[PDB]
C-alpha cells in the first residue's frame, strides 16, 4: 500500500479519496441540472463534504 493508492493529486480519479469526491460531485450536479439549485449551493456542499 502506497500513498498513490489513497490519492493521486488529480481531480480525475484512480484513488479512494478522488472517487469519494467525484461521486458526491456527480450527485450534486445531477440535482443541479434539474432547476433545483444554483452554482453556489453546489460549491458550498462540495466544500463541506471535502
Amino acid at each position: 500500500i502506497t500513498t498513490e493508492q489513497l490519492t493521486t493529486r488529480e481531480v480525475g480519479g484512480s484513488g479512494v479519496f478522488d472517487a469519494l469526491m467525484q461521486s458526491a460531485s456527480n450527485h450534486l450536479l445531477a440535482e443541479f441540472k434539474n432547476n433545483r439549485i444554483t452554482g453556489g449551493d453546489y460549491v458550498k456542499a462540495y466544500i463541506a463534504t471535502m
Binding site: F32, K33, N35, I37, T38
Partner: protein, 236 residues
C-alpha cells in the same frame, strides 16, 4: 430591434450565468426551459409598456348596421379573419402589420369627417362608451360612418412558433429592467431562501432603474402644449 435569439444569448451571458438552465458552452438557453423565459419576457414587456406610455397606435373601425358593441379583437381584422365564422370584418389592416391585440387604454376617437367624439361622457348624448376596457359602443350606427381610434398599445406577443413575433422593440435604456424582471421571476420560482434574497435584489434593481428613467425623462413622457383657453374664455 433584435430577435429573440439575441435575448436568449444575452441572458446566457449576463444574469442566469451559474444556473443550470444554460447549455454547457454558455451559448444559449436549453430547449426545455424556453417557454419559461418567453412567459417572463411577455410579463415584463406588459409591465413596462403599461408604466411608460411608449407606443401610440391607431386603428380604423367601420360601423355595421345592426351592431353596437365593437370589441377590438383580431377575429374581426381583415388580415386575420376566418371567412366561415365572421362574414364581414370591421377592422381594416390593408396597408401593413396585422393588428396584434394590444389595446391597453383608449385616448381619442375621431369621426371620418374630422370631428372629435367624446368618450365616457354621460351627459353628452353623442358620446362613445366602453363597457369593457377594449369594447367600444356607438348607440346610433349610421351609413357610411367610420371611426378612428387612438389608443395606448403594448408590445405584441412573442411566441417563437414559426408564426409569432420574433422581434423585440424596446428603448435601449430599459434592457436591464427586462433582464432584472426575468431573473426575479426565475429566482423566486426556485423556492429556496438564498434564491429568495437574490430575487428581492433583482426586483429592487428593476424598480430603481425605472425610477431613474422617470427622473431623467429619457422616453420624453412629459408633454406640454400652447395655451388655447386664453382665447375661448374671452380674454384680450
Amino acid at each position: 430591434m433584435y430577435y429573440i435569439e439575441e435575448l436568449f444569448c444575452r441572458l446566457a451571458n449576463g444574469v442566469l450565468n451559474n444556473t443550470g438552465i444554460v447549455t454547457d458552452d454558455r451559448g444559449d438557453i436549453e430547449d426545455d426551459s424556453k417557454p419559461f423565459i418567453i412567459v417572463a419576457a411577455n410579463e415584463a414587456l406588459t409591465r413596462l409598456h403599461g408604466r411608460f406610455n411608449m407606443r401610440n397606435n391607431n386603428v380604423v373601425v367601420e360601423m355595421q348596421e345592426g351592431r353596437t358593441n365593437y370589441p377590438l379583437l383580431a377575429k374581426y381584422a381583415v388580415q386575420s379573419y376566418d371567412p366561415n365564422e365572421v362574414k364581414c370584418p370591421f377592422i381594416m389592416d390593408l396597408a401593413g402589420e396585422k393588428f396584434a391585440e394590444d389595446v391597453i387604454r383608449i385616448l381619442e376617437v375621431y369621426d371620418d369627417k374630422g370631428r372629435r367624439r367624446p368618450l365616457n361622457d354621460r351627459n353628452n348624448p353623442c358620446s362613445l362608451f366602453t363597457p369593457r376596457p377594449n369594447v367600444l359602443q356607438n348607440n346610433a350606427p349610421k351609413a357610411w360612418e367610420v371611426l378612428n381610434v387612438m389608443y395606448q398599445a403594448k408590445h405584441p406577443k412573442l411566441s417563437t412558433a414559426e408564426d409569432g413575433y420574433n422581434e423585440i422593440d424596446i428603448p435601449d435604456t430599459l434592457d436591464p429592467a427586462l433582464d432584472a424582471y426575468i431573473a426575479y421571476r426565475y429566482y423566486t420560482s426556485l423556492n429556496t431562501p438564498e434564491s429568495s434574497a437574490k430575487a428581492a435584489e433583482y426586483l429592487s434593481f428593476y424598480d430603481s432603474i425605472c425610477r431613474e428613467v422617470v427622473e431623467y425623462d429619457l422616453t420624453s413622457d412629459t408633454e406640454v402644449d400652447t395655451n388655447t383657453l386664453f382665447r375661448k374664455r374671452g380674454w384680450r
